């Protein structure tokens, strides 16, 4: 419901997949699903900004 709290949950993921990168490596299955999952939330900043007419730019997570 909040943006900011949307980038850090990014950042974290971020952060939680260079962790992943070094015990596994960038090829293990796991780490390009996450990397997926990472881009997803990436995408949810660039979908709710291009739409910003919408009240899911609030409600992204959580209905009002």
């Given amino acids: ?16 997949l260079i962790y992943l990168v070094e015990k596994y490596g960038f090829t293990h299955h796991k780490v390009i699903s996450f990397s997926q999952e990472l881009d997803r ?3 949810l900043l660039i ?13 992204h997570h959580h209905h009002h």
């Fill in 1 to 16: 419901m909040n943006v900011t709290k949307l980038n850090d949950r990014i950042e974290a993921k971020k952060k939680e």
């Fill in 41 to 43: 939330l990436l995408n």
């Fill in 47 to 59: 979908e709710l900004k291009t739409k910003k007419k919408r009240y899911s730019l609030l409600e």
